[PDB]
Design a protein around this ligand. Structure first.
Ligand code: HEM
Ligand code: HEM
Ligand code: HEM
Lengths: 677, 323, 678
């Protein structure tokens, strides 16, 4: 159990009498009053201690990535990697290390929807036997800006307008696209966020990236430049925007529910930890500067090397104590890893330590159960708010005769101490500048766009079309068109159509036709359909329910999660039509006999909104899902003008429908259903 | 201008050079580095003062009613009500008092949707010449529970399940209806929340209520029991649930945007302040106890007497500092 | 070991390599720099995690009683007291409960002197098996004010002037005596603070008082009114003001070091817990209202009944984590005890809970090791800053079908719950008033003053003379005299002399000659001299040192702490004359031979300030200590004008001096040496 160290702080209230927070059994369902209909007494200590704790429950949300969810797991190393890193957690084959991972959006506040379009966080803590090591990454390999001092500018522009705090969890407003076009480094991450990466199907269907180049360091000090990669074993999958919008309202918790359900059902998600390793003398040899976080390294130049595997298999017991309180830091580094001069990374190190003082209102946040390491803490730190330990060493300073030299110093040769990469030098003048090697903001956005399928490209175009059409200021829209045109004239032209503007003339300076593998989502089918969801549209009249039950049993043998839907909660029915929506499902199937609720009064019961079954089938079809109908339920497909010989549409006998649905779920999205310019 | 008194704390940055928070002009678009492709220096006081303020921007959300929005306005008294209260802001015909009103839901956190089904807050501050007077009310005249010591139980049961923090801004889950059925006092407010009051068209189309019976006291100390009421001059209007669900995704800001646009276009919304006035010896006359916040007083027994009108006609300038 | 439960949060760093707070071995004696003489890098994560923790070490001091110290110990019940209370820590003979006690002054901030003149705090936590029970008491049985809403007024007036923050830890300034005379209820505690209770010899030599009337309640709801008393087994003892003033500078830590030394040396101090018990119908029976905390109940009307004894035998390991962080509350009440309508106690219940929010900046301060109960916490409280537990019950509300009714309600009949005294009632109008039964502010100050010895009375007079003479405003000094005159025309007259004013004519409304027992300090010799300190003035030249060593050996046989003083740290010398002062000792003894440093060449060494040996002996004599000289050292006594026949002065052979000093230490202070008016 990855949560094993946390059991000593678990509190079981089963079978017990209510108490105060300082002990003593109580009743706390009535205030103490002076007389039968009298005023409440200030001497009611029970009331005030109970209400004080309630009054003080909230702590500040994270300044970014406030909306997210997490889980525990285990990381297993595939080998003894000591030839590239002294990192203990990578030091032996089959070596296991506990982890906790939090996934998140970026812009929205604590209660914003999971399926907003956004960059997504992917933060991993390794509780190594040599200290906590955090990889604080995103589901996108590049970031918007090249210097950490610009982060408040980026975040202010994306977050809601400060006059009215509109809009929530959205880049589709004037200030974001003003910044995107005034700071053209942003264009690469922008294109990624406008692709499927901005609207993933679930946390389990995302890749992860450290973005920055780091260093792996061996015991003698030999270093390699490294990029961290998480490769989902579930396959990458994304929604379509019109679907994600409705899902934002029908289930704001879609992604955290998905992760919770997969772990609880015994379908733990996994990721492989992989690296690109680069010689120090090739930092600038691949057409860009590896210190520049707006660029990724094409895998053709450096293929991935697989270090091990992470599997998340334990949900938290208390969300707040665990998920909400955990404090990630890119400064959480261990021996065998070092930083680089990435000016974005450089400033993060300050900012994540400092922000914990705001969120936790004290300096002892590392003493919280979720933040504690497993490898033991020995230093001369004392006091501060909420100090939870009692230190024995009376001589809390160094150097010292009285403490016999303990706690002792550790370095590269003694005590397995951290050490900075020995060959690292500084040269030149102190400067408030960025290297001229950072200057190309358009080539890799073009490279990224080139590497998507044609409909995938149309999705990016249509995201930019939807977003920029919310920009009220006309000159900002023209500013956006001018920047997009530097990436591709065709992109600028197709976006310009939607804005009623004229696209500029071609500016070929950064145009090119190069492509790179691995950045697409829709060009690859899924490696497994386990945990994917099927909505079975049935009805309580006739034999439809009996057939739906049998249909559900066969589908479940493939590991599918099946919801039988009917007008009310009869036996065998998992969900009502009133509560049902196509956004919850990966496939939609009409059980035989249920065609009766797609027309007439059968479609107008007081038990659900008019047209609800037809809307579920229409939504599922238009959003590209596998849709099907058993036997006589083909009438439901006909009722919405859908024909069986279309891709992703299945009809016939129950055996055929099951095989087709299970096959179509591998394709996941049927892109034949989306027009291209 | 209702915001007049706030002019003295407003900060204009037009045409200005950038500074630190202790003065002195700066640039803050590049970190100071030790060489051309070098590391950032600790002695970059500009970076750290800028990022420290960013790192510490957030404060805890309200424990309840975290999602909401507000506006400034003016309350005007229709008469000299000294015969029923010594309250200065009600003491003369046409006397004007600045107000600020914040509307809200209850259960959802800061970024949850406006069109979630919920009780709605309707909280008014009168900046009177004898102190701030707050009517902290809802759009429903009755509350779930009868004793304040039970508020953490109600809220915990309605807010997300504490293992997975699901579901956001919704009573449609096990713990909420476990509480509603275990604490039957809650059934009255539940029915109101299940009605159109739970999914109103806009803040401007809500009535407001103080819920509790208070007292109005004259100079000589004679008292009347009183219920506060806000009657919308816009009329009450509600969505249908299947529409509110989609709208929650298509525009989570529907209500705060609606209030903002109405003020910005010059269509300031208005509410009449009204009271029900009850003699002390009638506290238990109408089939219930007027100390019981799970009951409202039927207007057949005590009509609404209009005292004045409130108009909200100025949006905030900075949402965080004000709202 | 009373600290046994705390052992699981103790951290041992011996034998270990240095780490960060998130693990990983490090070195932290050099900042990471860009080149040989280069600037420090922001990526030095080691530097910042270490300095951030240092930068945030301090928490707000207590708004009052900021200066203090404490210890762990054990309370032992002497009986099964179920006949008077349901409280479980008093429910069986020989039942043991861990305790932690903090002693304190009131006005001074954290670094102020122990021996400032002040009311003193005496706060005890019983970690009972039915929750933490706190008796938050003082070393004086009455308080300044009758309603808690006036506490910010009282404290603001006593604490430093808000323009310059002068004076530290002192009531000797205009605002305090303006308040004392404008708010005459304050006069009773004022008189106690002007007596020996204001300048005690140590924490171990104080009695303690809960002050308020509380209620004890049996299982069936029967209640008795109660006053809590702590009776020191070490005996009460006080300094003199002119000595406490020098002691404030020579050793600001006098009291906290005294308590620490006594415990580490195996001389654990003890107090008996005793109560006064009176029926409900006595609340207004004794010429005052028992809801009034400016009055005490004379023992002649209700005697002390001892319930048990507390012994403090374990020092803290980390002062900050244990002593600084502990959070007392009079609202920390258990089944078997209830409050009364004391308007001062009523407001305290709110104040102590709320103030923890400022000190600990979070709602979860009860989870701190020193604050945790031993009996178990089970409720539906969740989250909060710094939440240290992981709750398993996901149905965190009541009532509920899904949690099967757990945690379950407890009351008088089920689950040994707390219950308010069943018979308490309210009657009358809501009011912002005090009962007219609170109106007498002068009878009990007079009773207190009448009950002191004559020299003990001079000490009260001379403390008021000292303090009132710092008041610059003439009308305030007059206001003080008119208020003093209502207590005693003689007190007012003798105080008026020092102020150069005319005391008012007699105002006999409240005058009386009644006396009461138990309030004096100097009318009783000490019951033990264990831990008391003897300074032995010697010299490195001659054979004085060898005799002083033999003198030290015999005195330590009687349990005394002996310090041999000489010019330098020779073999057998505990302290140099440069470092020595009379305030540190309860008795001063010149060893034979040491007369050479009281005159001539021996008195003018560069190793100590001029006249230092003579000043130590002079101070000890005039501050009333037993002083002595062995053999030829009687020259030192003659060199300061002191003669053999005086009380508390001893000379002769070593055996004679040792016997005389040890019996004089029980007298403790020789009041023959202080002039009385007249
Ligand atoms: C490669 C660039 C970046 C990545 C991959 C990234 C990723 C993340 C992630 C995943 C989180 C949430 C961790 C969690 O789940 O609790 C987070 C939070 C945060 N980030 Fe970043 N971020 C980047 C850039 C920056 C920069 C440049 C700054 C400021 C200099 C910054 C400041 C913060 C802060 C203050 C938090 C709040 C963390 C907390 O409150 O615990 N980030 N970031
Ligand atoms: C008639 C019953 C109630 C009504 C009408 C009501 C209404 C409101 C409203 C409108 C707000 C939001 C104020 C704003 O917009 O800033 C609020 C917040 C709040 N309420 Fe209530 N509420 C009621 C019951 C209670 C009870 C019983 C408690 C606890 C004893 C409580 C505790 C709170 C707290 C702690 C806040 C947060 C205020 C802040 O952080 O500024 N409420 N309530
Ligand atoms: C009979 C009257 C009183 C007695 C015997 C008394 C005693 C004490 C003692 C011994 C302490 C120090 C506790 C410790 O060692 O940490 C203390 C602190 C304190 N007292 Fe009182 N006091 C009295 C009156 C009051 C009143 C009337 C108030 C306010 C209404 C008050 C508010 C406080 C506060 C806020 C603290 C700080 C507690 C903390 O920060 O933990 N006291 N008092």
């Amino acid at each position: 159990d990855a949560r094993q160290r946390l059991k000593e702080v678990e509190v079981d209230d089963n079978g017990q009498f209510m108490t105060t927070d300082f002990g003593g059994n109580i009743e706390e369902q009535f205030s103490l009053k002076a007389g039968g209909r009298g005023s409440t007494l200030l001497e009611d200590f029970i009331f005030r201690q109970k209400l004080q704790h309630f009054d003080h429950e909230r702590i500040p949300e994270r300044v970014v990535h406030a909306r997210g969810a997490g889980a525990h797991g285990i990381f297993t190393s595939y080998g003894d990697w000591s030839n590239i890193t002294a990192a203990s957690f990578l030091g032996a084959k089959d070596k296991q290390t506990p982890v906790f991972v939090r996934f998140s959006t970026v812009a929205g506040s604590r209660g914003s929807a999971d399926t907003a379009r956004d960059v997504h966080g992917f933060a991993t803590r390794f509780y190594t036997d040599e200290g906590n090591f955090d990889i604080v990454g995103n589901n996108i390999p590049v970031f918007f800006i090249q210097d950490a001092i610009r982060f408040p500018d980026l975040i202010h522009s994306v977050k809601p307008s400060p006059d009215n705090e509109v809009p929530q969890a959205a880049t589709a407003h004037d200030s974001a696209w003003d910044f995107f076009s005034s700071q053209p480094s942003a264009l690469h991450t922008l294109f990624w966020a406008m692709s499927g990466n901005g609207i993933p199907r679930s946390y389990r269907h995302m890749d992860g990236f450290g973005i920055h180049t780091f260093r792996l360091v061996t015991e003698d000090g030999k270093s390699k430049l490294v990029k961290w990669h998480w490769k989902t074993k579930q396959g990458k999958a994304a929604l379509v925007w019109e679907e994600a919008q409705v899902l934002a309202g029908k289930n704001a918790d879609f992604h955290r529910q998905d992760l919770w359900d997969a772990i609880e059902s015994g379908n733990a998600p996994s990721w492989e930890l992989a690296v690109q390793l680069i010689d120090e003398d090739k930092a600038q040899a691949y057409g860009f500067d590896l210190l520049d976080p707006t660029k990724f390294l094409p895998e053709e130049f450096a293929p991935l090397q697989v270090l091990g595997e992470m599997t998340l298999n334990r949900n938290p017991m208390n969300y707040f104590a665990e998920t909400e309180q955990i404090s990630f830091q890119p400064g959480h580094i261990v021996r065998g890893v070092d930083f680089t001069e990435d000016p974005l990374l450089q400033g993060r190190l300050y900012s994540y330590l400092d922000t914990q003082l705001n969120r936790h209102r004290g300096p002892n946040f590392e003493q919280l159960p979720i933040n504690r390491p497993v490898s033991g803490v020995h230093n001369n730190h004392r006091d501060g708010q909420g100090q939870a330990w009692i230190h024995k060493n009376i001589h809390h300073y160094s150097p010292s005769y009285l403490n016999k030299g303990y706690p002792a110093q550790a370095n590269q040769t003694v005590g397995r101490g951290f050490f900075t990469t020995p060959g690292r030098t500084a040269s030149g003048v102190l400067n408030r500048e960025l290297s001229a090697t950072f200057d190309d903001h358009y080539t890799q956005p073009r490279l990224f766009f080139n590497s998507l399928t044609p409909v995938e490209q149309q999705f990016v175009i249509n995201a930019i079309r939807f977003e920029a059409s919310h920009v009220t200021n006309e000159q900002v829209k023209k500013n956006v068109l001018e920047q997009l045109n530097k990436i591709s004239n065709d992109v600028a032209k197709r976006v310009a159509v939607a804005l009623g503007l004229e696209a500029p003339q071609p500016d070929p300076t950064y145009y090119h036709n190069n492509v790179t593998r691995g950045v697409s989502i829709f060009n690859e089918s899924l490696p497994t359909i386990a945990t994917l969801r099927v909505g079975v549209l049935s009805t309580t009249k006739g034999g439809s329910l009996d057939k739906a039950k049998a249909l559900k049993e066969q589908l479940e043998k493939d590991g599918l999660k099946v919801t039988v839907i009917a007008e009310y909660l009869a036996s065998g029915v998992d969900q009502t039509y009133s509560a049902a929506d196509a956004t919850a499902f990966d496939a939609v199937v009409v059980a035989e006999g249920a065609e009766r609720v797609f027309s007439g009064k059968g479609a107008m019961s007081p038990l659900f909104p008019a047209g609800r079954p037809s809307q579920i089938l229409t939504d599922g079809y238009r959003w590209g899902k596998p849709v099907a109908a058993v036997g006589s339920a083909k009438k439901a497909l006909q009722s919405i003008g859908v024909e069986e010989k279309e891709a992703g549409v299945y009809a016939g006998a129950q055996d055929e429908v099951i095989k087709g649905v299970e096959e179509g779920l591998k394709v996941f999205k049927f892109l034949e259903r989306f027009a291209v310019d």
